[PDB]
Hints:
The PDB classes it as ribosome. By secondary structure, chain B is α+β, with helices and mostly antiparallel strands. The radius of gyration of chain B is 15 Å and the shape is elongated. Chain B contains 1 helix and 2 strands; from the N terminus they run E-E-H. The relative contact order of chain B is 0.14. Chain B has a two-stranded antiparallel sheet with strand order 1-2. Chain B has one helix at 39-49; strands spanning 29-30, 37-38. Chain G has helices spanning 22-38, 41-48. Chain G is elongated, with a radius of gyration of 16 Å. Chains A and H meet through helix 3 of A and helix 1 of H. Zinc ion (ZN) binds at residues 20, 22-23, 25, 38, 40-41 of chain B. The structure holds one RNA strand.
Amino acid sequence: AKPLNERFFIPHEIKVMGRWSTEDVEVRDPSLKPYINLEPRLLPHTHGRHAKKHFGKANVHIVERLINKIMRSGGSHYKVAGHFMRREHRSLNSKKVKAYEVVKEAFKIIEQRTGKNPIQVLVWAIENAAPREDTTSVMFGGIRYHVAVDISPMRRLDVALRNIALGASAKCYRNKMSFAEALAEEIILAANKDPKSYAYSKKLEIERIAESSR
Amino acid sequence: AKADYNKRKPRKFGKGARRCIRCGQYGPIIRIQGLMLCRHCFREVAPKLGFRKYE
Amino acid sequence: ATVYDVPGDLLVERVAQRLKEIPEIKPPEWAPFVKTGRHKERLPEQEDWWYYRVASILRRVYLDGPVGIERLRTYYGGRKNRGHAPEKFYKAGGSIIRKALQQLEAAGFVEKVPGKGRVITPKGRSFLDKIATELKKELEEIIPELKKY
Amino acid sequence: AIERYFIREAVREMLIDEFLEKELRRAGYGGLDIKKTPLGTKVIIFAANPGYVIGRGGRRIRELTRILEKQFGLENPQIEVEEIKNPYLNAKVQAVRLAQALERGIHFRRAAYAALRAIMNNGARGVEIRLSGKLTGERAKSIRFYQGYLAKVGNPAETLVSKGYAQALLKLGVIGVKVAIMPPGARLPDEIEII
Amino acid sequence: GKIRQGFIKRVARELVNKYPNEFTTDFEHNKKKVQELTNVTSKKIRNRIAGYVTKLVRMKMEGK
Amino acid sequence: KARIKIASTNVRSLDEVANQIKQIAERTGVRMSGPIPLPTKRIRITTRKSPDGEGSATFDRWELRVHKRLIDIEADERAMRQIMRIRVPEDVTIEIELI
Amino acid sequence: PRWAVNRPKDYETGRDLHLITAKLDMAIREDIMRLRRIRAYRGIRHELGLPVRGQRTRSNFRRGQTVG
Amino acid sequence: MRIIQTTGKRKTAIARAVIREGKGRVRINGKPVEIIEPEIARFTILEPLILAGEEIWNSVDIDVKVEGGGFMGQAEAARMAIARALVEWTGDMSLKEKFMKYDRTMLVGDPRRTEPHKPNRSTKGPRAKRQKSYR
RNA sequence: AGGAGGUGCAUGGCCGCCGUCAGCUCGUACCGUGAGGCGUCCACUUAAGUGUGGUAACGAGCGAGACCCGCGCCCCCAGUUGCCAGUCCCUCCCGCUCGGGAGGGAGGCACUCUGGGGGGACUGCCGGCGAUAAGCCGGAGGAAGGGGCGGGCGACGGUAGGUCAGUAUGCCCCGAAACCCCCGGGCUACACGCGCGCUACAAUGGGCGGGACAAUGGGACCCGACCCCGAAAGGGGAAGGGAAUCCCCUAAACCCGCCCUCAGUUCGGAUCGCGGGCUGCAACUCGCCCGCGUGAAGCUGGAAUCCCUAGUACCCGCGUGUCAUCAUCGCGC
Ligand SMILES: [Zn+2]
């Protein structure tokens, strides 16, 4: 199936997966710019080592963060698209090689469909799927009140990545479409601001609820 | 009046083939290294046997 | 070149294709109606799986020799679906491995070392190494980095 | 294996100690030591009353030698008896003596205080005596008498402190006696002095 | 919590009082002197005593 | 050549026997291989604390450690005579083999 | 091979037979009827509809609806 | 010839690497690194050489023997051993600084090890526990 | 005599819970007629009744800490049954051998490793906050920064909490019976309700062929390499191993190629029929294993609810305890 030159690919420069470079990738959001890591990295696998340190995820490559978010089941105690996605023995939980292959194939599909840098498309999708305001309960006096609050860039990036992963899982759940194709479609839709994207729909819903609360 | 009765048949296997050397209990017998002791008795005689609690 | 210089699966398939010309290597009479281990669920779907298994056994003898029937069985075993019971590892059958080793010895690729198992003869070593050299020569054009090896 | 020998020897020694403890209760049994010799084995019994251990004419000691050879499987055993290094520091001996006093009929408080003061006077860092059972009525109670410095939690407590337990059988039931003694000269990790 | 033990503090104070000129602001020298001068047998306790001795010497130097 | 296998419960008695053999060889004038410490045997038994079944299950891990040393000494009349004259404490088991 | 057939040893003929569809159902029904006729324990269990291979029926094999 | 030995440890995997003057042949357990599978493990092994450079890669030969652990622990141990061997062979402080900035673990081992299991569903893990009933 | 007959509302011992919570007390003094109070309170800090300062209190004890075992880095010693990097010899193979690879020998311990003794990490130094103290936050160096990480050790007492059915033990009771032994049956029944799990409701897959990588432990009526006979289960002979020497032991998840392409299906594997074996004195009640055949609910789950903060959770297998045979279990890897 796969060509031998691809099965035994041998990189020679320090670039993401040995195929794509982040030198031309631009982040125009000042809030999310310092927290999206685009340093020259070949293998996006740090084996953890960032959970111990507070704000340690700011030094983890965005591709590795996407791989980690993809490495999950999809839904255990919440419902995505109105259904549970409890995959126990057939999930990607703790399968970094499978997550890496899925992300690589999705990036290739995105590159072929768009004609631009897949990392640039991912950055656009994250920017367009990161919410800016939320709602929360604050207890003053003897009772609570729901008020609108701002969202830190860390939480914005976390929510955007989680929403993208959940949308990909929902699109790939119990359909002929594969996980890589679903992830590529979700990323493209989020980048293009199409409402069918789960991440963009969730961002719009959260912002509308925050506007109503404030 | 026969002595042939009131005797126990020999048994080479089963719960009745092993008894604690201190109790005679037929239950949880430890045979890890030929100890042949109850799980209750081992708790009492481990310091005497030399076992300690390094872990 | 050497067997260590080429991927295992490509060399195994090439050796299996080559082995079809050896008269000694012949599938047994019960081959079409048997499974390759108790842990397997369905019959092989190759119609020529005997040559593939013989080639794999020959490569295993070349690499880990001397080796025996029991060790080859635990190599060729695998996980089994036990219904509602949890999955567990099981060994493979012995008749296939024994017949394959006997056929290889008849062909002259392996020989018995008493009390140790079966080792590869110089003829079998040359037979493997020539095919490995051809495979590496083919792979050199696709992967230029293998030229220095 | 080789650990089987160690396990078997330990089990045999523990059986010997338990049987001797049961048999020589009135003799102030304080333990035993077993040594292997090319001709056989020698067992030295620590006792505060050699008179009871040896007996009148040595009938008890010859019977003990026979039973040790025959029921415990010891080969060619020779038995010797020698004094307790310190009966007032041996917790087991003190517990057995207190149980015997309670069985005799001395008041529990008086006997406990007498034992406590005797052990305190004979040299010790600290003593604790706990009596549990049907004391002063049909409702059980536990009473502790303590003096000096003692350790209860930790490796120094498990190592330095010597513990002993005895059961006194009265006409109403059994009473548990627990004795913990800290021998003199024991230094806690906290205790540090300038040279 | 890194709360210095009472007996550690007492031992360090007694040492600094008894040998005022045998301890300096150098932790290595203080540890060597403590090991030579007292019968501490645990490395952790010796290190803690040396650290507190160094701290006390520094306070005595700056004038508290 | 003679092989000495010494196994005990306490490393201090093991080291005392080993030092005795080392000093005896040093005074004796033979070629002795250093004491080889074989892997320690740790017999571990886990037992339930409670005699009944009520309450949360709790376990204790009793352990017994056996230490082993190996010594190779070149054969010599007075050497291995003095070796058979070893004090051999109670907690130490010693085995002598001739190869 | 003789060990791959449906009936490796027929009860009546003793030959190795492979049966499909109506013959298979007829043979299975005949075996069950023979067990019931000889009044074996397996026949009793087949008649009662309870599990036949020595399973435990206290917590599982619940086919009926809740009562009480 | 100048032969330098280095050691790398990751989890239960131990890798011993021997580095000498050669023609760019890097072998792991007798197998060329270029045909190492999967791609993630191959990249893990090959990263230090790519960082070092093409000339240093091509003007040296490395042989690595790895035992224990899994396919990722062995790759990490081999990577650490190769990085240490390259730094020791070149004696290049700038290369050492580059390695430290890129990934500290390449020169400094990974102390992380499996935490021993504890009762209340020990087989599941040290902290995993049986589900509570409450009724 | 004996009792796995009652009594854990008569007891000893041990265990769970409050609770690894930070509490529980003493000498003298002082207050109150007294029960009692003080110290043990207040401000800051700590995981801590852990500390600093003030005080009608001044000094202590048991707890906490300290202490003990293991892990991560370095040094010394030790080199077999452990290890094989360099040097030498022999044999074999490849592109015909410039070069490369494999095995056996002598030889070495260099590396890993094993097991004894040490070093190192102590808020040590820099900046800030607090009050200049107790202490807290950040940073440098460092394998390891703030209890280094994970365990053992469970205080004074209570919980009439569980255990007389593990042993011990008071009273009552049976005492030719409730005591002892043997054959057979039951604890395995089954309209139903519940707790813990296993398998799944599929493509983040199922099947087929091929390619890789562990650790903890155990072995004498025992583990058994290796050879032969069988399609599998399994059967016959048998080297070595009382163990760093031999065996259990070439794990799975993972990767590559092919078939299936969203379907109650090549998903799912309960439920039955026939046949073949193992253990055991005995396999029907009531054991386990394999071959062929059939193929039930199940297409993601209401209210509600449980575990987990770093190599942790999830996923994937393995060792051992029970054991003649039987592991969807406990303890560990
Ligand atoms: Zn017992």
